[PDB]
C-alpha cells in the first residue's frame, strides 16, 4: 500500500476496540509526546483494548526526516506514506489512516481520526460507544449539516468554485475529531477514487459518506464533541469525549488535574 512506515502491531492476535489515528506534521514532536504520556497511552479501557497511532508523511527537510525516523524505530507507533506533509494534504493524510485500517486493522470496533491540539476522554468515549449499540456503517463527532463552502479568498478554509462548484456541502463532522465503525473504512476506501476530490479531508470524507448512503448521528443526547474548545473544569471533561485547542503544555495540565481529582465525585 506503499506504507514507508507500518505500526508494530498485529490487529487479528488482539483486534482493539478502539483505535487512535492522530495527524501531526513532523515538527510536531512535543504534541506526540503528550499525547503517547496522556489519551494517547495504550491501555484496556472497560477490558476494551486501546490502541494509537500518528499519521504522518514526508517532509523535504533530512533532519526532520532522520528524526521521524528515529522516533518511528522508537515508539513502533507511525504509519506514513510518500506525500508532502502539509495543511492542503491533509485529505491524503485521512485516506492513509482509513487505507491502513482496511488493509491492516479490519479487526478494529471503532476507530477515531483526530487532531494533535486535543483533549480526548477515551473512558467516556468508550462508555458512550458501548452504550449506543451502533456496530456497523457508524460516523459521529461534532455533526455539520448545512456548511457552506467558504468563498473569503484569504480564508484557511477557502475553496473556489474549481475546487468545489457548488453552494452547499454534504452533511460531515468537524475534522479536529470524528469517530466511525471500523467497517466504514473498508467503505470509504472503495469509494474514494470514484468521489469528487477536496483538499478539505472532513469535506472530503462527508462526500464519501453520502455516496454510501451512510448518515450521520449524534453519539449522545448531551453534546460530547467541542471543535470550538471549552473552559476547563474536571467534572466537564469527565462528561466530554473531545475539546479542541488544546497545547501540549495544557494537555499535560489537564491530564495531571484529572488524576490528581480521581475519586472525588462530581454533582
Ligand atoms: C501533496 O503531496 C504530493 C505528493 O508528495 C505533492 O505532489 C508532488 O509534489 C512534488 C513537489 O513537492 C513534485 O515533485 C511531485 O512531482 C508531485 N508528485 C505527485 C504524485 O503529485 C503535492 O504537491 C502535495 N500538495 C500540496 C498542496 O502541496
Ligand atoms: C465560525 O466557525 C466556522 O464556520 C465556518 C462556516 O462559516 C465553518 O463551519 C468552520 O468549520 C470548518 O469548515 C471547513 C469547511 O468549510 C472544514 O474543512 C473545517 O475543518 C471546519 N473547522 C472546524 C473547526 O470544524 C467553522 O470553524
Ligand atoms: O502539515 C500539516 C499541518 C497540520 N497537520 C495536522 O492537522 C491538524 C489540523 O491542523 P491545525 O490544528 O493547525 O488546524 P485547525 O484545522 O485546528 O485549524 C492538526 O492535528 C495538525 O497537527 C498535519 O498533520 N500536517
Ligand atoms: C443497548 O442495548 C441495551 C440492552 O438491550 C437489549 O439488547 C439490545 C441489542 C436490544 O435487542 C434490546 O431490545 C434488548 O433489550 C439497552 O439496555 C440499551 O438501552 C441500548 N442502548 C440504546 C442507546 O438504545
Ligand atoms: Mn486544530
Keep these: 500500500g506503499n506504507?514507508?512506515?507500518?505500526?508494530?502491531?498485529?490487529?487479528?492476535?488482539?483486534?482493539?476496540?478502539?483505535?487512535?489515528?492522530?495527524?501531526?506534521?513532523?515538527?510536531?514532536?512535543?504534541?506526540?509526546?503528550?499525547?503517547?504520556?496522556?489519551?494517547?497511552?495504550?491501555?484496556?479501557?472497560?477490558?476494551?483494548?486501546?490502541?494509537?497511532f500518528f499519521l504522518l508523511g514526508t517532509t523535504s527537510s533530512a533532519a526532520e526526516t532522520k528524526e521521524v525516523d528515529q522516533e518511528s524505530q522508537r515508539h513502533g507507533d507511525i504509519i506514513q506514506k510518500d506525500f508532502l506533509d502539509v495543511y492542503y494534504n491533509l485529505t491524503l493524510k485521512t485516506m492513509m489512516g482509513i487505507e491502513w485500517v482496511h488493509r491492516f486493522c479490519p479487526q478494529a470496533?471503532?476507530?477515531?481520526?483526530?487532531?494533535?491540539?486535543?483533549?480526548?476522554?477515551?473512558?467516556?468515549?468508550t462508555e458512550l460507544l458501548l452504550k449506543k449499540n451502533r456496530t456497523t456503517r457508524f460516523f459521529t463527532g461534532f455533526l455539520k449539516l448545512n456548511e457552506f463552502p467558504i468563498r473569503q479568498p484569504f480564508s484557511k478554509w477557502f475553496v473556489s468554485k474549481s475546487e468545489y462548484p457548488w453552494d452547499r456541502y454534504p452533511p460531515?463532522?468537524?475534522?479536529?475529531?470524528?469517530?466511525?465503525?471500523?467497517?466504514?473504512?473498508?467503505?470509504?476506501?472503495?469509494?474514494?477514487?470514484?468521489?469528487?476530490?477536496?483538499?478539505?479531508?472532513d469535506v472530503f470524507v462527508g462526500l464519501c459518506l453520502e455516496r454510501l448512503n451512510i448518515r450521520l448521528e449524534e453519539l449522545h443526547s448531551q453534546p460530547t464533541?467541542?471543535?470550538?474548545?471549552?473552559?476547563?473544569?474536571?467534572?466537564?471533561?469527565?462528561?466530554?469525549?473531545a475539546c479542541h485547542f488544546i497545547k501540549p503544555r495544557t494537555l499535560l495540565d489537564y491530564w495531571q488535574a484529572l488524576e490528581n481529582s480521581r475519586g472525588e465525585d462530581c454533582p
Design 225 to 241: 464533541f467541542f471543535p470550538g474548545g471549552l473552559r476547563f473544569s474536571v467534572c466537564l471533561f469527565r462528561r466530554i469525549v
Design 109 to 125: 470496533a471503532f476507530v477515531m481520526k483526530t487532531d494533535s491540539d486535543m483533549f480526548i476522554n477515551v473512558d467516556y468515549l
Design 172 to 201: 460531515f463532522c468537524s475534522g479536529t475529531g470524528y469517530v466511525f465503525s471500523g467497517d466504514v473504512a473498508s467503505q470509504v476506501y472503495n469509494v474514494s477514487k470514484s468521489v469528487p476530490y477536496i483538499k478539505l479531508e
Design 3 to 52: 506504507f514507508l512506515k507500518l505500526p508494530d502491531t498485529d490487529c487479528r492476535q488482539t483486534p482493539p476496540f478502539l483505535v487512535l489515528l492522530v495527524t501531526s506534521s513532523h515538527k510536531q514532536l512535543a504534541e506526540r509526546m503528550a499525547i503517547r504520556q496522556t489519551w494517547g497511552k495504550e491501555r484496556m479501557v472497560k477490558g476494551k483494548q486501546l490502541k494509537t
